[PDB]
Ligand binder design. Structure first.
Ligand SMILES: CCCCCCCCCCCCCCCCCC(=O)OC[C@H](COP(=O)([O-])OCC(O)COP(=O)([O-])OC[C@@H](COC(=O)CCCCCCCCCCCCCCCCC)OC(=O)CCCCCCCCCCCCCCCCC)OC(=O)CCCCCCCCCCCCCCCCC
Ligand SMILES: CCCCCCCCCCCCCCCCCC(=O)OC[C@H](COP(=O)([O-])OCC(O)COP(=O)([O-])OC[C@@H](COC(=O)CCCCCCCCCCCCCCCCC)OC(=O)CCCCCCCCCCCCCCCCC)OC(=O)CCCCCCCCCCCCCCCCC
Ligand SMILES: CCCCCCCCCCCCCCCCCC(=O)OC[C@H](COP(=O)([O-])OCC[N+](C)(C)C)OC(=O)CCCCCCCCCCCCCCCCC
Ligand SMILES: CCCCCCCCCCCCCCCCCC(=O)OC[C@H](COP(=O)([O-])OCC[N+](C)(C)C)OC(=O)CCCCCCCCCCCCCCCCC
Ligand SMILES: CCCCCCCCCCCCCCCCCC(=O)OC[C@H](COP(=O)(O)OCCN)OC(=O)CCCCCCCCCCCCCCCCC
Ligand SMILES: CCCCCCCCCCCCCCCCCC(=O)OC[C@H](COP(=O)(O)OCCN)OC(=O)CCCCCCCCCCCCCCCCC
Ligand SMILES: CCCCCCCCCCCCCCCCCC(=O)OC[C@H](COP(=O)(O)OCCN)OC(=O)CCCCCCCCCCCCCCCCC
Ligand SMILES: CCCCCCCCCCCCCCCCCC(=O)OC[C@H](COP(=O)(O)OCCN)OC(=O)CCCCCCCCCCCCCCCCC
Ligand SMILES: CCCCCCCCCCCCCCCCCC(=O)OC[C@H](COP(=O)(O)OCCN)OC(=O)CCCCCCCCCCCCCCCCC
Ligand SMILES: CCCCCCCCCCCC(=O)OC[C@H](COP(=O)(O)OCC[N+](C)(C)C)OC(=O)CCCCCCCCCCC
Lengths: 98, 316, 101, 168, 83, 96, 70, 347, 98
């Protein structure tokens, strides 16, 4: 493909693993989720720009607008957890075990 | 010669910033029936040099900060960006001739918020952190109308290049066709740079983020703050008071352009000496309930007005 | 290459002032001195973010005016701004932009 | 060493992801994303996308990420794993970097070549407009459907987040 | 007829900002349809030659395509100069 | 005033574009010759480097089609000077 | 008196005059006494690169006129 | 929540689902999913209690990860084909990501750990949308990409779904959890036959929705969420118990009820392809589902569990719930077997 | 689509951006326009089962213009040969290649 894809694509993989291995904070997971959309933006634009897909050039913008809107939703829920417990630890979201 | 060219743009800014402090203290003095700095050197012309030396040889407190890395990172980010917002400004020739220069000065401007945010975190104090957050809410709020007001003007220019705002006003200033936008742009630039009557960070009896700083590090946050005051007014002059450009005498542009920037800057000092200070909620409700409704109304008027009059500017 | 130099020089210089700022006063060997959440602030950050995203779709308007579909381009330009106004009218009426507890 | 600027940037780009994928304190995690977002723009710029490159700075870095730092400073209450993960990440990058600069061919899932990014660029370009600019402008001339669906989602987003946060 | 006047003058004394906002926006949506010059805006955009005008092979039956740029056939921009 | 000035700017752009259109036929003609020449330079030196390779063909298309395919950057400037390679790849993107 | 404020303004005025004046004169020093070529779109860049090759010496600001035609 | 806002939020969930169904561009397919998740989290929070908050947070973290993977697949496919058409994917690695991404969206095992918990934290009406409407959009995409799906990946997810659905439900006493695990089980049937005859995936989807909608409707009528609280129904609304009994036997696939129709037709199509071992295993393990369906019938209709004194007060008021379409749904849930050849309308 | 509404109503919602040989603003062609056009017209109206086997040639060229794997392999071979002959005193680059 090209040397740049190896690193851009590996960036998505790194962030994905970071999303699937929580440490303590719910916030740190949102960054990894927002890390994944950053890699997809870059990879999308590189493919579109290189091949001169003229009309596709608006596609990365939409990916960013919707992905950003999702983040606002995720941050709103993180706030409503800190309100209930005072911290955003993931181990507090264990009520629904039973 | 390019490296020589940069230094011919960085040092003058630092000296120009230094003597804006003198001009502010003097101008504020005469509007208050007093004189201001006139003892240190002829007419106070050495006053900035005394202050500069004094601050840099004073012990910095640097208390037990939580990180002590964001403490160093905040002043670097602030002063690094402030200088960076001058490279595309045509005077009349940009140092870097960006095709989306207007879009570059918006991108860099929104990054200055971090300097505020990181200073609050580094301070290790709960009180400071609330101080930073209040200044962040004000800054981002009033940067929404800058984006739209700027966008509305470009509908009359036709592109994002800054050198094309010179061509647009070759017959007449944009202050005339767009004085409603000019009124709300000038006030937005006051609120972005924490200038009175929008200075709540320095609004003693109410709060700042750059309070724990003293000596040299403090002087950095001061240079950045005053380096943007000049830059915003240079931006305003290019946007609403376009100077005619004669290629054979490029210096003629600079003299006229410099005057219009100095007058706009001295309007910041004029305004600070006149009015009281807004409350925090009162300046939020000035944006979300007064400027934003009108900015949206005027943005619609400017998308359609060129179409209904057949006056669409060229893309190139 | 020019812009990279301009960024490097600007940030390189800013760092030199910082280090000498933290070390030049240390030339003077001074005696060792010894020794919540508010919801209404979060909504401002989120409200800005959503409007900021709605602005992102408005940025390419200067280029859109050069098309040969002014009827369609004009209709959508007003459609976005009008909805950008509706998002404001909704928060305004539902007491979103208020600072009294 | 300048003809490989894009590849060099991408190596810094990956190292940033290891920075916050290891999950340090959120304050430092957000910083790594900022450095990664800024470098990410540098990659897009060198492929000819100047509007898209600056859009990340204005919307992603100066926009979203400010709110992330804004929320962290207000809901975060200011280890061996963090160092072990960070150390592990760089080593994986180092070997991948080492094995693509040695034989200029690395096969992990896909077949990645290592001649240089410039080798695929388009030779011919003599237009009087930016193809990226004309593509983005077509949002209003062509993308009527995208505008409607996108606008209704942002409008709903405002409504949705007002319900979530009210709490009653 | 009285209610409208009794309501227009009430907001004008209380909400001058919004009265100007809705008035200005209302013109943005109405005037473009009434304007007689809106059609020229389209004509000028179509007249801007971003692309090369590839010539057409001549088969013989085309007394509408000029043989030379200065021939009298084809579209004429004499309307744009006077405008 | 803005309407009048903006309308003249649209006439001055059309004149600016027609000067380009009258010049495209010459510029396109030159580029065709230049690109073909650069390809043959690589072709001649492809034989030199690979005249003793076990089972290699000179100038072998990697496409089943016989249609002309516009060369990419790697094929033209493959073995030229770095300064000229840099100019043709990032010269325009880096121009201030 | 108010005119004692001017000396500070002039020095501030001069420091804002050097950056603009320096760029204009420095550009003319490198471009053979002309304005630095502006290349915002690929067509403009293509002609500038053509000038570099056509000029002989590898300089884009060295113009060749009719005298260079047979 | 203001009533008008609730309708517009509900109407948005349909628009998101519909955009996925009618779109022909992978971008709009992703926008449809994003619009759907955005407008469904608010209803899950309507009661505003810690469990509702946790359920949405667990739900958001799952649908978001699936969306990124789906977008990632949409881009790998773009690199190898240079197009966005919603059809067979052109890169096998992209197909795996799309398959798993849609699996996380449907809750198919082993991406299932959130379904029991999410469904258990939100009201009954919110669970109905979560288990019936939310599966149409992911199933629309599978119906269009199945030629390129990996045979062993899809069948493996189907096999694990039936097993974990059956085994999970044996240990449960919460009706919201039982329906959650029952949902996972029926998903295996929907996807197991997908490679062979997708039309039988729509037959099993339509019948599953009708039966599940009936169950949630009758639990909402009596505001019952646990096994014990449901056992008082005989003493309050005896008719409701007989309707419950009929459906649970239908859900269990017992002849001659409608719920036998899907399982019956899936076995037919898999065998024509000479798949004898897989249908036999699937049918046997379905008995695990029929077990805890029967266990509900023992405590609800076939026995009279102890009552409470206060129940005598409830006899003096009627059911003021809407119970929309309950009479029609229950009849179509049990009396459709003679109409089996009507499935050709789905072709 | 699952519900082919667009074809029924005769309205174009998102079919303009599906491919890269569709109409683009200012007639800007994509880099692989010639290959994509040929592949699409080859495999039109014969379903994907036949197109997989009958239009394989037209599609391999298309995927060659997209990722240029064969071309980058060929250039890697020439570089390795030339590099080997460089450090053996057996190669002298031409004048214009220096
Ligand atoms: C063929 C297959 C046919 C099977 C169809 C299955 C239908 C079964 C419906 C469930 C029974 C409804 C019920 O009892 O109420 C429960 C529940 C209300 O109970 P609640 O929790 O006590 O009250 C909640 C609030 O407090 C409400 O309190 P409020 O005071 O704020 O009131 C707000 C307002 C709100 O009023 C409304 O609810 C109207 C909503 C608009 C529906 C869209 C209109 C569609 C037509 C235009 C297109 O009033 C109501 O809440 C009315 C109560 C609900 C009765 C109306 C239910 C209509 C469902 C039939 C339409 C199905 C279309 C899909 C539904 C949308 C997908 C999520 O209503 C629902 O939300 C049901 C959701 C249904 C989702 C599943 C739909 C089936 C999926 C398959 C689709 C067909 C594919 C083939
Ligand atoms: C296509 C043509 C199909 C015919 C559609 C007409 C029936 C739907 C309209 C009936 C209605 O108002 O409620 C429907 C609908 C469902 O409410 P419901 O609780 O199920 O109605 C039964 C109550 O007893 C309702 O009790 P109610 O006394 O309160 O309501 C009196 C209602 C009584 O109207 C009725 O007769 C309700 C029962 C009609 C049948 C309901 C199912 C709709 C037909 C589906 C057929 C499926 C066939 C499947 C065949 C598969 C095998 C090939 O009379 C009307 O208002 C007729 C309005 C005419 C428009 O109400 C709504 O919320 C939408 C308005
Ligand atoms: C370095 C220290 C930190 C820098 C922070 C400030 C970033 C400056 C803005 C980035 C450059 C840019 O936007 O260019 C726009 C401008 C827009 O230019 P343009 O759109 O007018 O196009 C220029 C060429 N023409 C006009 C002919 C088409 O880009 C350029 O002018 C030149 C692009 C050069 C690309 C190289 C970028 C390298 C730098 C990127 C990495 C930065 C790392 C940041 C680290 C994290 C901090 C955020
Ligand atoms: C109300 C409180 C805030 C007010 C702010 C007041 C300061 C803002 C500046 C407004 C006054 C305009 C600047 C006047 C001084 C400019 C001197 C100058 O450049 O030469 C005269 C300039 C020279 O002209 P010019 O070149 O600068 O601009 C004219 C542009 N054309 C030719 C297109 C119309 O003209 C004047 O200012 C006449 C007054
Ligand atoms: C010539 C005649 C011109 C037309 C007539 C003018 C238009 C009529 C409407 C103007 C009156 C607006 C309604 C109103 O009176 O608002 C008052 C109210 C103020 O409430 P508040 O200040 O918060 O009270 C606090 C007390 N301590 O505030 C409110 O009630 C909320 C108002 C929300 C306003 C929404 C702002 C976004 C819209 C901006 C305009 C953009 C264009 C809109 C689309 C126009 C389409 C044509
Ligand atoms: C691909 C390669 C994957 C393997 C990479 C291994 C990286 C692990 C490096 C060591 C490490 O991360 O620390 C040990 C780990 C967690 O750190 P730990 O010391 O347990 O912190 C609490 C101790 N009281 O302790 C553990 O629990 C080990 C976790 C599994 C590894
Ligand atoms: C066809 C394409 C265009 C489609 C446009 C359709 C979308 C329009 C979007 C509008 C933007 C959202 C704003 C709408 C909400 C208005 C504000 C509101 O919510 O109501 C507030 C007000 C409450 O009243 P209250 O404060 O309690 O007491 C004093 C009232 N006098 O309640 C009220 O009673 C205030 C009166 C209602 C506001 C009327 C606004 C009318 C605006 C259109 C005017 C057009 C005039 C243009 C003519 C210009 C010619 C000079
Ligand atoms: C309550 C009342 C609300 C307000 C009602 C409307 C007020 C009047 C309109 C003001 C708003 C529009 C602003 C237009 C400014 C245009 C500048 C101008 O006025 O100059 C006239 C200009 C001169 O023509 P020119 O071609 O240059 O002549 C020399 C050629 N050899 O020629 C032109 O500019 C071109 C003509 C543009 C016409 C635009 C207006 C189209 C609508 C037709 C007029 C009806 C007005 C609408 C009334 C209903 C309001 C709802
Ligand atoms: C004193 C009361 C007022 C208070 C201060 C007011 C504010 C400060 C004034 C505004 C700032 C202007 C400061 C600069 C003015 C002095 C410079 C000047 O007048 O222009 C000199 C210029 C230099 O000549 P040059 O550009 O090198 O020409 C080379 C041709 N081969 O010669 C030229 O050719 C120019 C044409
Ligand atoms: C633990 C380490 C993690 C990974 C980062 C590596 C840092 C140390 C260098 C080892 C790898 C290497 O070989 O460094 C070298 C590479 C340079 O590549 P290039 O200019 O394209 O070389 C090809 C061009 N020549 C032939 C002219 C050299 O450096 C980088 O790309 C920079 C990485 C960020 C600093």
């Amino acid at each position: 493909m090209s040397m740049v894809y190896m690193n851009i694509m590996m960036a998505f993989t790194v962030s994905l693993v970071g999303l699937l291995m929580y440490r303590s904070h719910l916030m740190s997971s949102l960054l990894c989720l927002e890390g994944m959309m950053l890699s997809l933006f870059v990879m999308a634009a590189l493919t579109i720009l290189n091949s001169h897909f003229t009309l596709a050039s608006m596609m990365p913008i939409i990916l960013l607008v919707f992905a950003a809107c999702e983040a606002a939703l995720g941050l709103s829920l993180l706030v409503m957890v800190s309100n209930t417990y005072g911290t955003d630890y993931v181990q507090n979201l264990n009520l629904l075990q039973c | 010669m390019f490296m020589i060219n940069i230094l011919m743009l960085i040092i003058p800014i630092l000296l120009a910033v230094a003597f804006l402090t003198l001009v502010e203290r003097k101008v504020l003095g005469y509007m208050q029936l007093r004189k201001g700095p006139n003892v240190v050197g002829p007419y106070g012309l050495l006053q900035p040099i005394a202050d500069a030396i004094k601050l840099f040889i004073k012990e910095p407190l640097r208390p037990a900060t939580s990180s002590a890395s964001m403490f160093i990172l905040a002043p670097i980010m602030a002063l690094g960006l402030a200088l960076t917002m001058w490279i595309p400004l045509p005077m009349p020739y940009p140092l870097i001739n960006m095709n989306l220069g207007v879009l570059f000065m918006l991108a860099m401007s929104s990054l200055a918020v971090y300097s505020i945010l990181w200073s609050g975190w580094a301070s290790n104090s709960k009180y400071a952190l609330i101080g930073a957050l209040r200044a962040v809410a004000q800054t981002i709020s009033y940067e929404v109308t800058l984006a739209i007001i700027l966008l509305s003007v470009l509908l009359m220019s036709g592109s994002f290049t800054l050198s094309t705002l010179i061509t647009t006003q070759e017959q007449m200033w944009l202050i005339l066709p767009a004085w409603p936008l000019a009124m709300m742009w000038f006030i937005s630039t006051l609120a972005e740079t924490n200038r009175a009557p929008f200075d709540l960070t320095e609004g003693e009896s109410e709060l700042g983020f750059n309070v724990e700083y003293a000596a040299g590090p403090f002087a950095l946050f001061f240079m950045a703050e005053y380096a943007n005051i000049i830059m915003m007014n240079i931006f305003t002059a290019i946007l609403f008071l376009g100077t005619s450009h004669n290629p054979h005498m490029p210096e003629l542009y600079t003299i006229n352009f410099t005057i219009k920037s100095l007058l706009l800057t001295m309007s910041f000092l004029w305004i600070r000496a006149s009015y009281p200070r807004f409350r925090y909620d009162q300046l939020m409700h000035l944006l979300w309930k007064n400027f934003l409704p009108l900015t949206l109304a005027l943005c619609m008027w400017h998308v359609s007005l060129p179409i209904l009059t057949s006056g669409i500017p060229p893309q190139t | 290459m020019n812009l990279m130099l301009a960024l490097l020089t600007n940030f390189t210089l800013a760092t030199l002032l910082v280090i000498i700022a933290f070390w030049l006063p240390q030339l003077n060997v001074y005696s060792e001195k010894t020794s919540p959440f508010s919801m209404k602030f979060f909504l401002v950050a989120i409200t800005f973010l959503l409007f900021d995203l709605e602005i992102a779709l408005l940025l390419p308007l200067p280029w859109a005016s050069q098309t040969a579909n002014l009827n369609t381009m004009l209709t959508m330009a007003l459609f976005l701004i009008i909805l950008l106004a509706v998002s404001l009218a909704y928060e305004w009426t539902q007491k979103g932009l208020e600072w009294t507890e | 060493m300048m003809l490989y600027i894009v590849f060099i940037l991408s190596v810094i780009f990956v190292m940033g992801f290891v920075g916050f994928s290891s999950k340090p304190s959120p304050i430092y995690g957000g910083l790594g994303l900022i450095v990664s977002g800024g470098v990410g723009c540098g990659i897009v710029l060198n492929f000819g996308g100047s509007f898209l490159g600056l859009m990340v700075f204005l919307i992603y870095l100066g926009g979203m990420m400010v709110v992330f730092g804004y929320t962290t400073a207000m809901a975060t209450e200011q280890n061996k794993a963090v160092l072990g993960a960070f150390v592990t990440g760089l080593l994986m990058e180092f070997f991948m970097v080492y094995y693509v600069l040695k034989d200029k061919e690395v096969e992990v899932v896909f077949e990645f070549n290592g001649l240089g990014d410039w080798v695929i660029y388009d030779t011919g370009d003599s237009g009087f407009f930016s193809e990226e600019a004309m593509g983005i402008a077509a949002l209003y001339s062509y993308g009527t459907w995208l505008v409607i669906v996108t606008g209704w989602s942002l409008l709903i987003g405002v409504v949705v987040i007002m319900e979530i946060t009210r709490g009653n | 007829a009285e209610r409208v006047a009794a309501f227009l003058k009430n907001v004008w004394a209380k909400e001058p900002v919004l009265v100007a906002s809705f008035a200005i926006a209302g013109l943005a949506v109405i005037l473009p349809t009434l304007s007689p010059y809106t059609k020229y805006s389209l004509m000028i955009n179509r007249a801007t030659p971003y692309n090369y005008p590839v010539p057409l092979r001549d088969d013989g039956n085309m007394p509408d395509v000029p043989s030379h740029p200065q021939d009298p056939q084809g579209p004429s921009l004499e309307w744009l100069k006077r405008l | 005033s803005m309407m009048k000035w903006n309308r003249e700017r649209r006439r001055l752009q059309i004149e600016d574009f027609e000067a380009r259109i009258a010049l495209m036929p010459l510029l396109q003609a030159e580029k065709d010759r230049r690109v073909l020449q650069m390809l043959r330079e690589n072709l001649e030196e492809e034989a030199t480097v690979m005249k003793d390779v076990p089972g290699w063909k000179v100038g072998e298309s990697v496409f089943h089609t016989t249609r002309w395919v516009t060369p990419m950057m790697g094929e033209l400037y493959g073995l030229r000077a770095s300064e000229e390679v840099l100019s043709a790849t990032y010269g325009f993107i880096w121009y201030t | 008196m108010w005119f004692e404020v001017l000396p500070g303004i002039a020095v501030m005025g001069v420091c804002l005059f050097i950056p603009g004046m320096a760029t204009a004169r420095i550009h003319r020093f490198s471009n053979g006494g002309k304005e630095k070529r502006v290349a915002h779109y690929p067509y403009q860049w293509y002609l500038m690169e053509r000038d570099r090759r056509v000029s002989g010496v590898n300089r884009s600001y060295v113009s060749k006129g009719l005298e260079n035609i047979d | 929540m203001n009533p008008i806002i609730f309708i517009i939020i509900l109407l948005t969930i349909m628009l998101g689902t519909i955009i996925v169904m009618i779109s022909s561009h992978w971008l709009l397919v992703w926008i449809g999913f994003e619009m759907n998740m955005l407008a469904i989290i608010p209803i899950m929070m309507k009661n505003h209690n810690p469990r509702a908050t946790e359920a949405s947070t667990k739900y958001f973290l799952t649908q978001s990860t699936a969306s990124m993977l789906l977008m990632m697949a949409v881009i790998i496919n773009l690199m190898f084909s240079g197009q966005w058409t919603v059809m067979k994917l052109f890169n096998p690695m992209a197909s795996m990501l799309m398959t798993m991404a849609l699996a996380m969206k449907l809750g198919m095992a082993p991406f299932h750990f959130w379904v029991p918990e999410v469904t258990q934290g939100i009201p009954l009406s919110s669970g109905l949308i979560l288990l019936t409407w939310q599966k149409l959009a992911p199933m629309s995409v599978l119906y269009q990409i199945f030629p390129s799906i990996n045979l062993n990946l899809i069948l493996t997810l189907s096999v694990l779904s039936i097993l974990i659905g059956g085994w999970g439900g044996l240990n449960q006493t919460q009706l919201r959890k039982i329906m959650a695990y029952s949902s996972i089980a029926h998903m295996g049937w929907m996807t197991a036959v997908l490679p062979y005859n997708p039309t039988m995936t729509l037959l099993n989807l339509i019948i599953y929705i009708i039966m599940t909608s009936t169950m949630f409707t009758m639990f909402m009528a009596n505001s019952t969420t646990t096994t014990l609280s449901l056992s008082h129904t005989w003493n309050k609304t005896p008719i409701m118990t007989v309707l419950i009994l009929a459906t649970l036997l239908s859900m269990g696939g017992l002849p001659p009820l409608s719920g036998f129709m899907p399982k019956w037709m899936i076995i037919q199509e898999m065998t024509k392809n000479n798949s004898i071992i897989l249908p036999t295993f699937m049918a046997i393990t379905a008995l695990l589902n029929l077990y805890f369906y029967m266990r509900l019938t023992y405590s609800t209709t076939l026995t009279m569990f102890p009552s409470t004194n206060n129940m005598k007060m409830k006899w003096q008021f009627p059911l003021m719930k809407k119970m929309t379409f309950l009479p029609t749904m229950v009849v179509l849930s049990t009396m459709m077997l003679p109409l089996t050849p009507m499935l050709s309308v789905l072709e | 689509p699952f519900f082919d509404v667009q074809k029924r109503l005769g309205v174009d919602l998102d079919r303009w951006m599906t491919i890269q040989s569709a109409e683009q603003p200012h007639k800007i062609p994509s880099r692989c326009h010639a290959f994509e056009k040929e592949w699409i017209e080859c495999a039109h109206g014969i379903g994907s089962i036949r197109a997989e086997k009958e239009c394989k040639i037209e599609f391999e060229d298309f995927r060659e213009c997209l990722l240029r794997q064969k071309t980058m392999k060929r250039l890697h071979a020439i570089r390795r040969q030339r590099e080997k002959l460089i450090k053996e005193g057996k190669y002298t680059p031409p004048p214009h290649h220096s």
